[PDB]
Amino acid sequence: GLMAASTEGVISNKQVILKDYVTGFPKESDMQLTTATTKLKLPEGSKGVLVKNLYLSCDPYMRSRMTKREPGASYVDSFDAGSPIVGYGVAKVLESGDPKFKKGDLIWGMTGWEEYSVITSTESLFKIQHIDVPLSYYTGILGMPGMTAYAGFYEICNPKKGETVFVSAASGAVGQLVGQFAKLLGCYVVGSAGSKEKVDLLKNKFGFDNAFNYKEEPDLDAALKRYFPEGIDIYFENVGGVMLDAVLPNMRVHGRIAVCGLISQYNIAAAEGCRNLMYLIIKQVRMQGFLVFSYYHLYEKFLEMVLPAIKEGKLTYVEDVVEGLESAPAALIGLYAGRNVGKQVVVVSRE
Amino acid sequence: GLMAASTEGVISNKQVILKDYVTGFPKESDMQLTTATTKLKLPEGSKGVLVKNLYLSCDPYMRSRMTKREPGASYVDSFDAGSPIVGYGVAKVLESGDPKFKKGDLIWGMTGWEEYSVITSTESLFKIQHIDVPLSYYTGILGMPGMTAYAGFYEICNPKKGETVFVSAASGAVGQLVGQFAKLLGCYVVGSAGSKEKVDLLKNKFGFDNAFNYKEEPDLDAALKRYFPEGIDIYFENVGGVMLDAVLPNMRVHGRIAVCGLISQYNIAAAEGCRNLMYLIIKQVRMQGFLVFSYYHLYEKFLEMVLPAIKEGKLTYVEDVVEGLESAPAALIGLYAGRNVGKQVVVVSRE
Ligand SMILES: NC(=O)c1ccc[n+]([C@@H]2O[C@H](COP(=O)([O-])OP(=O)(O)OC[C@H]3O[C@@H](n4cnc5c(N)ncnc54)[C@H](OP(=O)(O)O)[C@@H]3O)[C@@H](O)[C@H]2O)c1
Ligand SMILES: NC(=O)c1ccc[n+]([C@@H]2O[C@H](COP(=O)([O-])OP(=O)(O)OC[C@H]3O[C@@H](n4cnc5c(N)ncnc54)[C@H](OP(=O)(O)O)[C@@H]3O)[C@@H](O)[C@H]2O)c1
Ligand code: NA
Ligand code: NA
Numbered sequence: 195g196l197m198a199a200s201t202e203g204v205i206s207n208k209q210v211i212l213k214d215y216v217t218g219f220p221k222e223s224d225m226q227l228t229t230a231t232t233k234l235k236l237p238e239g240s241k242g243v244l245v246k247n248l249y250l251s252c253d254p255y256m257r258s259r260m261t262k263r264e265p266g267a268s269y270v271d272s273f274d275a276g277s278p279i280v281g282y283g284v285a286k287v288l289e290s291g292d293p294k295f296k297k298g299d300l301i302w303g304m305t306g307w308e309e310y311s312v313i314t315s316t317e318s319l320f321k322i323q324h325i326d327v328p329l330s331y332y333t334g335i336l337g338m339p340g341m342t343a344y345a346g347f348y349e350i351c352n353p354k355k356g357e358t359v360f361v362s363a364a365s366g367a368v369g370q371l372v373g374q375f376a377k378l379l380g381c382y383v384v385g386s387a388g389s390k391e392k393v394d395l396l397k398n399k400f401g402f403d404n405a406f407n408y409k410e411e412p413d414l415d416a417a418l419k420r421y422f423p424e425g426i427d428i429y430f431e432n433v434g435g436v437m438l439d440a441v442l443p444n445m446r447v448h449g450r451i452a453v454c455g456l457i458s459q460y461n462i463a464a465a466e467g468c469r470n471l472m473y474l475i476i477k478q479v480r481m482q483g484f485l486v487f488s489y490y491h492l493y494e495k496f497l498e499m500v501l502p503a504i505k506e507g508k509l510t511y512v513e514d515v516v517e518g519l520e521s522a523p524a525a526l527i528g529l530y531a532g533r534n535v536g537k538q539v540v541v542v543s544r545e
Numbered sequence: 546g547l548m549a550a551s552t553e554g555v556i557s558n559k560q561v562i563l564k565d566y567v568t569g570f571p572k573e574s575d576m577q578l579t580t581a582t583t584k585l586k587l588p589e590g591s592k593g594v595l596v597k598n599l600y601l602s603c604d605p606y607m608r609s610r611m612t613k614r615e616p617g618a619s620y621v622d623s624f625d626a627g628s629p630i631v632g633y634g635v636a637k638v639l640e641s642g643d644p645k646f647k648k649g650d651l652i653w654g655m656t657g658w659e660e661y662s663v664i665t666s667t668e669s670l671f672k673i674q675h676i677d678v679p680l681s682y683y684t685g686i687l688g689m690p691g692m693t694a695y696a697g698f699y700e701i702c703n704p705k706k707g708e709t710v711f712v713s714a715a716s717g718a719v720g721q722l723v724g725q726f727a728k729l730l731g732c733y734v735v736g737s738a739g740s741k742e743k744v745d746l747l748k749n750k751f752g753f754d755n756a757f758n759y760k761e762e763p764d765l766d767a768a769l770k771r772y773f774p775e776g777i778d779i780y781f782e783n784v785g786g787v788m789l790d791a792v793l794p795n796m797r798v799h800g801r802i803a804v805c806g807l808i809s810q811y812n813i814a815a816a817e818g819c820r821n822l823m824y825l826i827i828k829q830v831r832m833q834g835f836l837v838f839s840y841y842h843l844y845e846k847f848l849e850m851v852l853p854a855i856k857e858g859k860l861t862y863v864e865d866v867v868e869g870l871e872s873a874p875a876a877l878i879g880l881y882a883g884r885n886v887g888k889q890v891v892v893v894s895r896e
Contacts, residue, residue, distance in 0.1 A: 267794065269827060453825045453826055455826070456822060456823055456826070459823060464820065465818075465820040465821070465822070466818060466820070467816075467817060467818005467819060467820055468819045469816040469817070469818055469819075470816070471785065471789075471819055472810060473834075474804045474832065474833070475804055475806070475807070475835070475836065476618070476619070476836075477834070478835050478836055479833070479834055480831065480832075481831075481833070482829075482831045482832070482833075483829055483830055485826065485827075488829065
């Protein structure tokens with residue numbers, strides 16, 4: 195077989211399309227791998243960038259964008275059926291209408307699930323300077339998940355030396371950093387995760403004081419009392435559901451719950467009830483939700499702290515890396531089954 | 546018929562006894578009116594007071610004390626089966642072992658459901674000085690409920706001029722004050738209550754901007770959008786249950802929920818689930834429980850503000866007054882049916 199090159203400079207652009215809006219849990223077959231065509235040229239008048247995508251993030255929030263809604267009651271618009279999935283990634287600039295960015299610069303920000311994207315505005319892109327770390331880190335510890343852990347722990351939890359900290363989904367992109375931040379502060383830290391592998395990772399890689407497999411614990415209250423005989427000062431909440439109900443009676447007086455996520459609720463049409471809210475009164479607890487995008491003014495301050503800590507080996511990170519856009523649908527769905535061990539990354543292209 | 550006076554100075558002391566611990570909703574027949582005897586003499590060595598009870602408070606928390614528990618996981622010990630109900634009241638000192646208190650002084654604090662009580666310690670009693678108000682006010686606006694409204698609204702809600710405020714159980718002991726405090730601050734204030742009488746009281750007596758009868762609203766979300774077309778900055782939560790679920794999607798960004806009470810949950814063995822907690826994240830809401838007893842250091846500051854406001858007619862109060870200890874069981878149970886119109890008081894004796 196033989197394929198002539200295009201005399202109009204057309205090349206192939208593989209894409210992951212959302213075929214149609216999703217009800218309940220997403221399936222691989224809700225997405226379609228396709229091959230489009232592109233002339234690698236920016237639209238006339240573009241103030242944006244034409245990029246080659248290198249790495250894509252799989253992030254839990256992305257399921258919410260697969261449900262059809264009008265712009266509102268969500269912080270962000272639905273995906274468009276028939277168009278590529280969009281999400282955070284790391285890309286190389288091919289052409290720019292903004293002279294801040296030149297060919298060969300590396301960026302992170304919202305991009306398409308495709309080999310090549312046009313991003314119409316640069317105002318929400320970050321130009322990468324420090325490349326003495328794996329570039330995939332700018333989807334996790336040096337991107338949106340790392341900023342989430344930094345904001346949620348240091349700005350919402352009011353953490354103090356000697357406090358007790360519980361983290362759910364603790365081996366994941368956000369949780370693995372919260373627990374390290376807490377350990378470095380001098381807190382007692384425990385995490386919950388969904389397998390022996392992830393429990394062992396918490397104790398051995400991340401230095402949590404203890405951890406347990408929630409899927410093997412018939413009695414979550416008894417598990418939390420095993421590790422917190424005098425209660426929990428801070429709950430960093432990533433999951434919601436039965437774990438939140440089990441936590442509430444185990445909070446300390448003036449305890450805090452940072453409500454980062456509620457991933458156990460993301461795929462069911464009607465959420466489970468939280469039943470132990472009386473303990474917010476009895477223990478005088480502050481339960482506070484937050485959105486990372488309200489804290490990006492702190493990003494440069496965050497990088498000034500975390501880059502040298504990674505270099506010094508004070509902070510570490512575990513990524514789950516899968517190869518190719520072809521892998522991306524299964525990697526995204528896998529978040530809701532705990533398939534990922536650490537932060538889920540898709541490698542579209544290393545260069 | 547003829548009854549000789551006792552040659553040992555014994556007199557009759559009517560009491561309301563808890564016959565046995567309560568499961569589910571309390572009944573009048575869970576309590577027993579009885580006549581004991583007393584020699585109005587303090588025990589040898591007593592550092593406390595012998596008092597004549599004048600007024601008793603019916604307060605929602607009292608149901609929790611009718612369930613048997615070990616000392617813990619509740620901020621206070623169960624009632625004793627076979628002994629008088631205890632709760633906040635207003636009393637006259639007959640005899641004292643503490644010379645701070647003399648015969649004829651008026652106090653408020655925790656006392657027995659009886660004509661005469663021995664209170665073993667004075668450390669938690671307040672000696673009343675200002676008697677140019679109804680003495681019953683020291684069970685409500687000048688007692689524990691008034692302190693609750695002051696602390697919860699001014700210390701937990703971070704209220705600001707022009708903010709939107711929603712109050713549940715808004716015609717009750719606490720809620721009727723929160724809404725007045727909010728109106729005086731320049732907030733837009735709406736309240737929910739369980740009857741037309743109480744709705745009309747909110748608009749006409751307390752100057753709320755609006756109010757509605759939750760028992761007549763099939764769609765609580767639609768009712769809240771009627772009164773809050775741009776959402777709720779502060780929810781002062783007294784009820785929990787379906788009202789909390791309806792509020793959450795109607796919160797404004799950086800909205801606050803002061804969790805004072807959850808009375809819809811007090812009598813059912815398993816609480817209803819709160820299902821809309823995702824909105825704590827989407828709207829970045831602070832949902833914070835508190836206990837009035839952590840704020841009694843502010844009581845003298847509270848009285849310096851509220852006494853002149855009551856005298857000037859800036860603040861008003863509505864009490865539901867029933868006559869006699871014989872009325873007390875039905876008045877207490879009535880709280881869980883909304884029988885009370887305003888703060889529920891029992892008159893044991895006017896002097
Ligand atoms: N507020 C914000 O701005 C913000 C930003 C970023 C992330 N978040 C939230 O933070 C949380 C963590 O995100 P992440 O990126 O770090 O994800 P992640 O932990 O790397 O991956 C998701 C993990 O969720 C766990 N999980 C999935 N379904 C579950 C269920 N039904 N019950 C309990 N655990 C379940 C799984 O771990 P196990 O194997 O341990 O079950 C899975 O590996 C998510 O809720 C996300 O939405 C919020
Ligand atoms: N955190 C603290 O330190 C503290 C201190 C004091 C009080 N509190 C709490 O504050 C709340 C109000 O106390 P309060 O003394 O002012 O009581 P209150 O409002 O004077 O009386 C209770 C009222 O609750 C309402 N209610 C009863 N069952 C209900 C249900 N199933 N659904 C909805 N509403 C229901 C009724 O009003 P409607 O006719 O309008 O239904 C009833 O009149 C209570 O939850 C109490 O426990 C907390
Ligand atoms: Na501690
Ligand atoms: Na407002």
